[PDB]
């Protein structure tokens, strides 16, 4: 098989910048190379074919170059919506093969999270469960610390954190932090706090509720 190597799994760029993703074929594939963009949760989208030709409707900012074994896909002026994995593919021989993909990461300015805390719903409590969830929305960079406190005491067990991919519009991240308790445990305490620590401030963002009111 022809191996298509994208040696960079990730490439960082900034909106408005030019980024070039490289692909190396393990043998001469002439120009039988296509480039695909796969946005999170989406099917791949053909951008470049025959190494340098834009597919129909593909914006001018997308170009490809190269012949033989070394291929480059370039976004001349990155947009937030270009957050995607980019794949090269050779159509030179069977089997068709793809590069491993290069994920474009967009470096934007730091943004503090908007933190929202939610008590368990009455429905869940009826089931004898109690999930307390904290949304930490639209922050950058991805690194963030969430600390749960129950009646002022740090609670580490039962916490699950899920980060989004970078937002295709503003390149931020969001994350959900869910503290799952039994209903019995949840009702043995009053104050529930998620504290978001992020490099945008030395002061944690603190969101709380008291089960009483």
């Amino acid at each position: 098989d022809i191996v298509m190597t994208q040696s960079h799994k990730f490439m960082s760029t900034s909106v408005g910048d030019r980024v070039s993703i490289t692909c190396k074929a393990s043998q001469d594939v002439s120009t039988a190379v296509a480039w695909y963009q796969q946005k999170p949760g989406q099917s791949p989208k053909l951008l470049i074919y025959s190494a340098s030709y834009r597919y129909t409707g593909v914006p001018d900012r997308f170009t490809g170059s190269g012949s033989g074994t070394d291929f480059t896909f370039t976004i001349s002026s990155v947009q937030a919506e270009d957050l995607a994995v980019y794949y090269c593919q050779q159509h030179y021989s069977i089997p068709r093969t793809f590069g491993g993909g290069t994920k474009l990461e967009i470096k934007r300015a730091d943004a503090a999270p908007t933190v929202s805390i939610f008590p368990p719903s009455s429905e869940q409590l009826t089931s004898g469960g109690a999930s307390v969830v904290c949304f930490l929305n639209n922050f950058y960079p991805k690194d963030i610390n969430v600390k749960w406190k129950i009646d002022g005491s740090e609670r580490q067990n039962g916490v699950l954190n899920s980060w989004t991919d970078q937002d295709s519009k503003d390149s931020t991240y969001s994350m959900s932090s869910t503290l799952t308790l039994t209903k019995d445990e949840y009702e043995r305490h009053n104050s529930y706090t998620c504290e978001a620590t992020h490099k945008t401030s030395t002061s944690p963002i603190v969101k709380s509720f008291n089960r009483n009111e």
């Binding site: 099917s43 908007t114 939610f118 869940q124 949304f135």
Partner: protein
Amino acid sequence: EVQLQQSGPELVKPGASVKISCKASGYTFTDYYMNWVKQSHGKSLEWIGNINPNNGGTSYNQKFKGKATLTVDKSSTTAYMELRSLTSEDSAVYYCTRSPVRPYYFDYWGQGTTLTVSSAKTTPPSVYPLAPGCGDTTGSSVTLGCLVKGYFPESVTVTWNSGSLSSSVHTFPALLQSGLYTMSSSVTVPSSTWPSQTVTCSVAHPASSTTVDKKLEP
């Protein structure tokens, strides 16, 4: 326009087979090859093989020979891929994608079919609304959410107000815990529009054919 409409998500037990379909419309079905591509979670695209709809001729990635059987039904402009001897290594998204005779590329793609190979039972999600506690302060916008807890297999779709809110939505990737997935979705709307106007999350779990709508209430 060209559409490759794949069959819905599949949960299959190990050792079973599955046949995924790709209904092509909007073009001359027999003028393009149909290809199938595997994409394991977090991994790259793998070309399985193609089929010439004109004559049913197939070309396989040797790695998938026997594993995958490509067929076509010209009359229904549908391509099929049967995957056999299934294990969790086959759990992946499978795409059909069209390729011309020339030039050489995959220009139209199906939406993908998620295959989960597992002995686990379908478990519909418990859907819980995430509305601010009575103590919260109202700002310019309000973040609401739906917690989608304890479902399997993974395919779930949360739609806020029938998709009218999607620009303000965050979909948090599902986490697998004790064999069940949990995800959440948030929506942020101007506080001037909620609760004055209804905000509803609709959570579809295709495997269990369940839809749970939660109207977010203060």
